[PDB]
Amino acid sequence: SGFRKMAFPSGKVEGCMVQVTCGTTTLNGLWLDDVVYCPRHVICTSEDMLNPNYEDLLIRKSNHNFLVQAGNVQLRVIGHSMQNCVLKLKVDTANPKTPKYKFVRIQPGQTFSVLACYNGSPSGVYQCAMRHNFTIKGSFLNGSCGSVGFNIDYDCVSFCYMHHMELPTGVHAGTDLEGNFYGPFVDRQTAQAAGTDTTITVNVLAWLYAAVINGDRWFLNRFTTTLNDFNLVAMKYNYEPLTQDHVDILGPLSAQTGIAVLDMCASLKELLQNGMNGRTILGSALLEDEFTPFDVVRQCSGVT
Amino acid sequence: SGFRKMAFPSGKVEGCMVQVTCGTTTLNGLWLDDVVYCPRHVICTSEDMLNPNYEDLLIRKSNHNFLVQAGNVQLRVIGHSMQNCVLKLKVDTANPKTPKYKFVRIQPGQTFSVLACYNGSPSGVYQCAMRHNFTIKGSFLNGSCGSVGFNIDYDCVSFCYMHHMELPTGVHAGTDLEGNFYGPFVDRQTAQAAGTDTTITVNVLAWLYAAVINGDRWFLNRFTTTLNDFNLVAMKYNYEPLTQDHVDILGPLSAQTGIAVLDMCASLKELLQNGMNGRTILGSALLEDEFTPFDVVRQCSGVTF
């Protein structure tokens, strides 16, 4: 038993991290088969990033201008192309450590592991959720752009995030691996700020099921509610509206515990209205919203 | 910026995890060069574990009784011996991806990354602190025994924990890699329970420094205190007594922020006596005590491996 925020083992992604350097700009890249994927702003000086025209800046670059290092070993770039906000550097050597992989665009509320990297080398690994304002609450310093977020399922690594930047509130923004930015953000030093954010209701409910499975059950009230009545309360606390699709993805947890989703909703409604009364749930004094239903299922069942 | 509970990259340890199966008992082992290290109770049936005679149970076993699998490749056992609660299985093939490593015994308050594993396959990675009652608060299911905890210290993987068991309050117990159990615990189904625990004061202070480094300032005050006056308050809240050694290891964080340790102690005193003002610190509504001072330094400076 026990419930912890748990990252995927990072070794499969570690084997793909490289350093990419253009003049005075160094960042991280992702080496899969014979392509290195990295943020396109590697071709910018810091002054270029104030107002870049990427098409023009990339005309000005040759393959030689890209120094790609896998460890201390140089990989020769033999082509370069841009896809939205990502650069794809073709190299002369296919990564022998390439895992089976997919590129996926994730949805608000979904979680993933971040392997935070500097100069192509890993610092550490942690879980993040895509927030509804399309930011994540990570831990990133200068030089971390190009670090990736991912999920692993049995053999397959699904890459879903590539880090780009930090907004002035200290939260983090980036793209999928096709180079499209989550949210209304751009890869330029120009004013942009995170929108308002909601609490991820379906995740809070998943975490309450995690608590029940691990024997933390004081908040269960054995009452029930309707979806409509729950959402009227939840809206007052800036919670995301709960839909029947959310009810369905909680299905495996409702199945395992025998507690109806709407019963858990009644317990959550009372926690919102009354607070926790100096008690904790799974060691927390706030209602945690960065565990998905699948995170709970798979941690509680020991997958892979 | 940002501050997260951050595990070490796990790939160096992943390449060392194997499955060890003896009859009806399967768990995880650690394959370094030509030796696999695993909990000795792999040689026990669940019935044996009620009252095991480990020296007798070991001598009854042959090399053939151990099936060791590294992914899909079987590793033939060519010798076996026992050190405390750890079994060492000599194998015919050396692990070609053995990291530079050390077996270290950690002290209460120190943290490590746990690579949770089942059937020799890693499931996830997360940080744990060794509590003062010598348990850890992890996430472990049946089959997780033999999962290891570790730190990376420059160029060296320092293995410090091998998981054994869960106590009835849901906390977790295990050994170092020499097979000695942290705490007064034994590898047998006999009655044992976690003792009283304290909050790890030096880690709370480190985390408050992490918060200042990341731009929090609301809990800072103009006051300072002494070690003895702080400990009078800490005692009332079941905090570990702050020692001068603790003050010393907080030196680098005090240096970076310019805030003296006993100034930060006066902030912590006010937080304990008056609460957290309905506010969160680094996303927590409680005072977090599972970040060491070096955990703060390594995360805030971007140390890589």
Ligand SMILES: *[C@@](O)(C(=O)NCc1nccs1)C1(NC(=O)[C@@H](COC)NC(=O)[C@H](NC(=O)C2CCC(F)(F)CC2)C2CCCCC2)CCC1
């Ligand atoms: C890289 O982008 C990087 O490390 N990004 C991720 C970071 N996470 C936390 C801090 S940085 C590189 N950039 C930098 O290290 C950094 C300093 O470069 C000398 N520059 C930036 O991060 C820029 N960011 C911004 O200007 C912010 C300002 C506030 C905002 F809201 F407007 C958003 C942008 C660049 C980020 C990428 C787009 C252009 C500006 C490491 C070399 C690149």
Ligand SMILES: *[C@@](O)(C(=O)NCc1nccs1)C1(NC(=O)[C@@H](COC)NC(=O)[C@H](NC(=O)C2CCC(F)(F)CC2)C2CCCCC2)CCC1
């Ligand atoms: C292995 O020990 C293991 O997985 N241990 C770690 C666990 N963490 C959370 C749950 S288990 C193996 N054992 C089991 O999976 C498990 C079921 O085996 C059929 N057996 C045990 O965990 C035993 N534990 C106990 O009897 C408890 C009871 C309460 C306590 F406080 F007394 C402590 C021991 C064994 C643990 C190791 C020592 C002997 C008993 C996977 C096959 C081995």
